[PDB]
């Protein structure tokens, strides 16, 4: 059938005309098949033959297993068709789904060919079956239904099905139906008798619109759906002696996927191997830490884990745990500890960061996910003391706000690992540091002078103004006692260090951090350079 | 009869993805939008419309309102609403003693929108967990939030306001987007009475917050007053002055700098020379007075920066060329994102009153944090443009009070 529904007006892009690609000549078996196929389609209404007035043409092919498929190459018509509203904005996530008592799935056969094409647009879908050795005119046809391979077909189909279903939905809100491509999945909380009664009204409501039409484990979209739980579809980690780049990329992918429900999956040590430019076929020996992570992953996957579905009447609880190395892991549940979903956060927003900054940005990411999946933020449980956090975000310059949360003692806990003094330290040595770099030679001198008369100038190769100014601070921290005042003219270095970094990609910065943790008091001050600020000009001299 | 609205040459409509919304806000919009559909102000659209602008609910009042982010559409019609049919901005509004802001957005629903333009006004109410397809709509009437709306309505507006202006020639009435700014020099009780009469005039046409811009004074860069002076205090003073030197012409520093001559311990109290006290004096006079040689340019975007100062206080500058500050202010007094969101609205309002433009904001916050939360406190009906930045740590203290 061809649905009686109204058609969707289609137009080409402004200033553009429909296609006129020439029909490559075909072998005689190919065109014979195309003649067989096009007369079956013509009799069912899917196509119609046309006069040679129509100047439009799109090439057609055929390929074969022992029966033949018609393939129309809509590349040029697609390039000239208007853009459409994108078909889906996102996939429903299992953890957002409600528990259902009875689920059956139904598949639309003849999906696109059951939906009419805008009569004003059919002229451009014209194609031509050529003659044998392209002697005589060929048989010209056009589509009356949505052709497969045209860029409007997914949009207009899914839209047609929404208009068709919206009566039955409003006359039956309790029932849920999911449209994806040809698929109709239908769920309800009715008893398996009265439920199969409602599926028939749906079928009969479908056939009145020209759409003719299973077991608990529905393998869908990578997931395994059951009526009362979900999980990821089975994860098999290969047992290889040699790992290729392509093997590890696929493993990182399955693990990333498995981490939606399997808590605590770690992948960093596996990802570290992919860094480099090596070919897909090259074998990478597993490092010691990578084979340690593969071990923990194999164990986490040992016994099946499932996820539960969402009860809209209950709060969501999100728990986060630090796994070190900037890897975070989280679980969302409504009754402890029956998880709706798990995940991991391991990004690096910036070059230098601290656990408090990392934990906040993991909170934001879980929060956005929550609004997508359930439409509300969860109540958080965080491995950070309420006062560690109050300390940090009131003194820090960026704004923040994490929603309702509670401390939960699941070590490791998030700490600030040092605190810069707010006032200069009396009876502590004042270092006036400074770094510089001649920008053609790429040589630099990092140095300091002291109010107690000490001086020092080390020389660096392979450096920049930025790196030397951090070397000069590193020096002052090496050579000083537990308490120390430092005066730099590098806003660069002051910005990094006043952020209380925890970790960095710069092992220089990491050395400075290990110094600042060992100290007991450190005051850091900035003066402008070349303004002649006492000590500043003298270590500027020495450099 | 509709006014044909055309986009800038060779520009397409907005294709801006809808941000995720919470259950309570999706429910609010679904009520609002079925009601507007009955009344015919919007109509469902099909997949042949590829355009989208995002939509949100605010609460300004105890009733959800609908807010459409037309920032992208406004950028793409900007020839139309600014040069071809611009509303002139009166220089007198910033002088008036009282300014009341009134919402007249509901006027735009009277007016049909050019039938060949309604496709660019498309928006989607989305679905929790994407379980259902988005409800899609387009406007038929002049939409609130679109800068084309006041442009098209300005002929009808001056007709509505014609009697009231004739009878109160000392009252300034400026229209920006969905708001009427009404400025008078009257005593506050007389002022409110005049606003009450003006609501009556509007009320005869389907049209049902008090600023004192006179009391908007610049927040000058403040130099500490002190008994003793450590070298740390003078260093922080030279740094704060030398940077102020880049804005205010005439700041001098070198007399201070020779109080710091050797490599002195930071905590040692340095005696002040009397030419130093002479110079802190001379500098304070400059920093109190407005910047010399900085003028608004109607052709250049306004920039606003905001620095968090801790303890619920925030500083801000408005400028078109960095360090040429047209305006510097503070804003004060719970929640960092709530306060910033209040600060942006305040600075935008002042920016509409003073220039007829909203500034582009440099926000000191994580983009994800901001986009998550700003709707929860946003109560204006426009939206300014914004970037996200990392506040230069020195700048923070150079504007501290
Ligand atoms: C019904 C369905 C099916 C699929 C795929 C099936 C395959 N393959 C995908 C979605 C998104 C839904 N949808 C329909 C849309 C809607 O609006 N709401 C929904 C609410 N709750 C559920 N839960 C649920 C519980 C248990 C099972 C099982 N077994 C399946 C589903 N499903 C919903």
Swiss-Prot record, chain A:
It is found in: Virion. Changing residue 187 to V: Confers resistance to efavirenz and nevirapine. The record marks 392, 405 as: Essential for RT p66/p51 heterodimerization. Changing residue 86 to K: Confers resistance to pyrophosphate analog PFA. Changing residue 115 to I: Confers resistance to zidovudine. Mg(2+) 1 binds at residues 107, 182-183. Changing residue 205 to Y: Confers resistance to lamivudine, pyrophosphate analog PFA and zidovudine. Changing residue 178 to C: Confers multi-NNRTI resistance. Changing residue 72 to L: Confers resistance to HBY 097. Changing residue 98 to P: Confers resistance to TMC125. The record marks 431-432 as: Cleavage. Changing residue 153 to A: Confers resistance to pyrophosphate analog PFA. Mg(2+) 2 binds at residues 434, 469, 489, 540. This is Reverse transcriptase/ribonuclease H. It comes from Human immunodeficiency virus type 1 group M subtype B (isolate HXB2) (HIV-1). The gene is gag-pol. The chain holds residues 588 to 1139 of 1435 of the full protein.
């Amino acid at each position: 059938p061809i649905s009686p529904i109204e058609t969707v007006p289609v137009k080409l892009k402004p200033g553009m005309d429909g296609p006129k690609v020439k029909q490559w000549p075909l072998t005689e078996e190919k065109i014979k098949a195309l003649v067989e196929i096009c007369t079956e389609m013509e009799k069912e209404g899917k196509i119609s033959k046309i006069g040679p007035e129509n100047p439009y043409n799109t090439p057609v092919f055929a390929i074969k297993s022992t029966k033949w498929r018609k393939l129309v190459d809509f590349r040029e018509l697609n390039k000239r068709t208007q853009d459409f509203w994108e078909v889906q904005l996102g996939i429903p996530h299992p953890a957002g789904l409600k528990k259902k008592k009875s689920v059956t799935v139904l598949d639309v056969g003849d999906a696109y060919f059951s939906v009419p094409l805008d009569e004003d647009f059919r002229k451009y879908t014209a194609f031509t079956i050529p003659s044998i050795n392209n002697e005589t005119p060929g048989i010209r046809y056009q589509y009356n239904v949505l052709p497969q391979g045209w860029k409007g077909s997914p949009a207009i189909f899914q839209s047609s099905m929404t208009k068709i279903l919206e009566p039955f939905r409003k006359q039956n809100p309790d029932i849920v139906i999911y449209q994806y491509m040809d698929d109709l999945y239908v769920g309800s909380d009715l008893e398996i008798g009265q439920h199969r009664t409602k599926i028939e009204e749906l079928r009969q409501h479908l056939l009145r619109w020209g759409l003719t039409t299973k077991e608990p484990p529905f393998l869908w979209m990578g997931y395994e759906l059951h009526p009362d739980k979900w999980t990821v579809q089975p994860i098999v980690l290969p047992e290889k002696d040699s790992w290729t780049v392509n093997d590890i990329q696929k493993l990182v992918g399955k693990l990333n996927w498995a981490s939606q429900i399997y808590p605590g999956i770690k992948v960093r040590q596996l990802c570290k191997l992919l860094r480099g430019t090596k070919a897909l076929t090259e074998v990478i020996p597993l490092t010691e830490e990578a084979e340690l992570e593969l071990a923990e992953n194999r164990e986490i996957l040992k016994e099946p884990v499932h996820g539960v579905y969402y009860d809209p009447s209950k709060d969501l609880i999100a728990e986060i745990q630090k796994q070190g190395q900037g890897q975070w892991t989280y679980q969302i549940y409504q009754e402890p500890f029956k998880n709706l979903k798990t995940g991991k956060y391991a990004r690096m927003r910036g070059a230098h960061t601290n656990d408090v900054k990392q934990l906040t940005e993991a909170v934001q990411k879980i929060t956005t996910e929550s609004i997508v999946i359930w439409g509300k933020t969860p109540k958080f449980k965080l491995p950070i003391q309420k006062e560690t956090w109050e300390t940090w975000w009131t003194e820090y310059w960026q704004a923040t706000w994490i929603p309702e949360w509670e401390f939960v003692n699941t070590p490791p806990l998030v700490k600030l690992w040092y605190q810069l003094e707010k006032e200069p330290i009396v009876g502590a040595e004042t270092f006036y540091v400074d770094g510089a770099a001649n920008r053609e030679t790429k040589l630099g001198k990092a140095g300091y002078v002291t109010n107690r008369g000490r001086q020092k100038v080390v020389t660096l190769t392979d450096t920049t103004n930025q790196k030397t100014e951090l070397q000069a601070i590193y020096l002052a921290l090496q050579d000083s006692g537990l308490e120390v005042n430092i005066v730099t003219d590098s806003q660069y270095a002051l910005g990094i260090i006043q952020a209380q970094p925890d970790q960095s990609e710069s092992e220089l910065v990491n050395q400075i951090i290990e110094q600042l943790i060992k100290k007991e008091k450190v005051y850091l001050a900035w003066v402008p350079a070349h303004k002649g600020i006492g000590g500043n000009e003298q270590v500027d001299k020495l450099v | 009869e509709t006014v044909p609205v055309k986009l800038k040459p060779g520009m397409d409509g907005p294709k801006v993805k809808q941000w995720p919304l919470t259950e309570e806000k999706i429910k609010a919009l679904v009520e609002i939008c079925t009601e507007m559909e009955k009344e015919g102000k919007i109509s469902k659209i099909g997949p042949e419309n590829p355009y989208n602008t995002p939509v949100f609910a605010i609460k300004k009042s105890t009733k959800w309102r609908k807010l459409v982010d037309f920032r992208e559409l406004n950028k793409r019609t900007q020839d139309f609403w600014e040069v071809q049919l611009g509303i002139p901005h009166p220089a007198g509004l910033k002088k008036k003693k009282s300014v009341t802001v009134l919402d007249v957005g509901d006027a735009y629903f009277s007016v049909p929108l050019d039938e060949d333009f309604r496709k660019y006004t498309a928006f989607t109410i989305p679905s929790i967990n994407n379980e259902t397809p988005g409800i899609r709509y387009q406007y038929n009437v002049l939409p609130q939030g679109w800068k084309g709306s006041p442009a098209i309505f300005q002929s009808s507006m001056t007709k509505i306001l014609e009697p009231f202006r004739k009878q109160n020639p000392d009252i300034v009435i400026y229209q920006y987007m969905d708001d009427l700014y009404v400025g008078s020099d009257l005593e506050i009780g007389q002022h409110r009475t005049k606003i009450e009469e003006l609501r009556q005039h509007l009320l005869r046409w389907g049209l049902t917050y008090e600023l004192h811009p006179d009391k908007w004074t610049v927040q000058p860069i403040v130099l500490p007053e002190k008994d003793s002076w450590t070298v740390n205090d003078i260093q922080k003073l030279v740094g704060k002055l030398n940077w102020a030197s880049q804005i205010y012409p005439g700041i001098k520093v070198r007399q201070l700098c020779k109080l710091l001559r050797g490599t002195k311990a930071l905590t040692e109290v340095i005696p002040l020379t009397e030419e130093a006290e002479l110079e802190l004096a001379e500098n304070r006079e400059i920093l109190k007075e407005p910047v010399h040689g900085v003028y608004y340019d109607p052709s250049k975007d306004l920039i606003a920066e905001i620095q968090k100062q801790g303890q619920g206080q925030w500083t801000y500058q408005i400028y078109q060329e960095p360090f040429k500050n047209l305006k510097t202010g503070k804003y004060a007094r719970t929640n960092d994102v709530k306060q910033l969101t209040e600060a942006v609205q305040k600075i935008t309002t002042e920016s509409i009153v003073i220039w007829g433009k909203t500034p582009k904001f440099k926000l000191p916050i994580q983009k994800e944090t901001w986009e998550t939360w700003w709707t929860e406190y946003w109560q204006a009906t426009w939206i300014p443009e914004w970037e996200f930045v990392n506040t230069p740590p020195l700048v923070k203290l150079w504007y501290q009070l």
